[PDB]
Every structure is written in structure tokens, then in C-alpha cells.
């Protein structure tokens, strides 16, 4: 996960002002599951 | 393949050649010719599971 939020404000006067926000978020989840069962039988009878 | 009848395996030759089969538990009459006929069992099992 990431949050990356930035904010800037500005004003100038003898009048102009800006207040501004931009921020972007990422999420990831990988999930893994695995199974392997192997087997062998021999039976030799006399 | 097994093919057709070649030997007369019931030629008794005038003999009363009884044999007791312990397996079948019964008296059988052998032919006069047969060198031996016997009934001991062998059982021979391969299992192989994978």
C-alpha cells in the first residue's frame, strides 16, 4: 500500500490565490495457495 | 493361441490311477501316460498403485 498526498496553497496581493490538492493511492494483494500430494504403493505377495 | 486337441489325455490304459486332489478335495483318475499331475497351488500377486 501507498498513500502519497501533497498540498500547496498560494496567494498574492497588491489579488490571486490558489489552493490545490493532488494525491494518488495504490493497493496490491497477491494471494498464493498450493498443494501437491504424491504417493505410491507396491505389494508383491507369493 | 491354444489350438485344437492333439493328445488323448484321457487314455487310461486299463489302470485305476486315482489321485486325490487336496485342492478340489476329490478323487480324479489320471491317464496312464501322464508323467505327473499335481495340485499344489501358487498365488502370485503384484499390486502397484501410483
Swiss-Prot record, chain A:
Domain of life: Eukaryota
Post-translational modification: All cysteine residues are assumed to be cross-linked to one another. Individual modules containing an even number of conserved cysteine residues are supposed to have disulfide linkages only within the same module.
Cystine crosslinks: 5-23
Cellular localisation: Secreted; Target cell membrane
Coiled coil: none
Residue stretches spanning the membrane: 8-18
Function: Component of the membrane attack complex (MAC), a multiprotein complex activated by the complement cascade, which inserts into a target cell membrane and forms a pore, leading to target cell membrane rupture and cell lysis. The MAC is initiated by proteolytic cleavage of C5 into complement C5b in response to the classical, alternative, lectin and GZMK complement pathways. The complement pathways consist in a cascade of proteins that leads to phagocytosis and breakdown of pathogens and signaling that strengthens the adaptive immune system.
Oligomeric and partner information: Component of the membrane attack complex (MAC), composed of complement C5b, C6, C7, C8A, C8B, C8G and multiple copies of the pore-forming subunit C9.
Recorded family membership: Belongs to the complement C6/C7/C8/C9 family.
Medical condition linked: Complement component 6 deficiency: A rare defect of the complement classical pathway associated with susceptibility to severe recurrent infections, predominantly by Neisseria gonorrhoeae or Neisseria meningitidis.
Name by which UniProt lists this protein: Complement component C6
Organism in which the protein naturally occurs: Homo sapiens
Lineage per the UniProt record: Eukaryota, Metazoa, Chordata, Craniata, Vertebrata
Residue range from the parent sequence: 395 to 443 of 934
Curated annotation (Swiss-Prot), chain B:
Post-translational modification: C-, N- and O-glycosylated. O-glycosylated with core 1 or possibly core 8 glycans.
Location(s) in or outside the cell: Secreted; Target cell membrane
Domain of life: Eukaryota
Noted disease: Complement component 7 deficiency: A rare defect of the complement classical pathway associated with susceptibility to severe recurrent infections, predominantly by Neisseria gonorrhoeae or Neisseria meningitidis.
Chain's role: Component of the membrane attack complex (MAC), a multiprotein complex activated by the complement cascade, which inserts into a target cell membrane and forms a pore, leading to target cell membrane rupture and cell lysis. The MAC is initiated by proteolytic cleavage of C5 into complement C5b in response to the classical, alternative, lectin and GZMK complement pathways. The complement pathways consist in a cascade of proteins that leads to phagocytosis and breakdown of pathogens and signaling that strengthens the adaptive immune system. C7 serves as a membrane anchor.
Subunit structure as annotated in this protein's UniProt entry: Monomer or dimer; as a C5b-7 complex it can also form multimeric rosettes. Component of the membrane attack complex (MAC), composed of complement C5b, C6, C7, C8A, C8B, C8G and multiple copies of the pore-forming subunit C9.
Assigned protein family: Belongs to the complement C6/C7/C8/C9 family.
Protein name from the UniProt record: Complement component C7
Organism lineage string: Eukaryota, Metazoa, Chordata, Craniata, Vertebrata
Residues of the full protein shown: 150 to 199 of 843
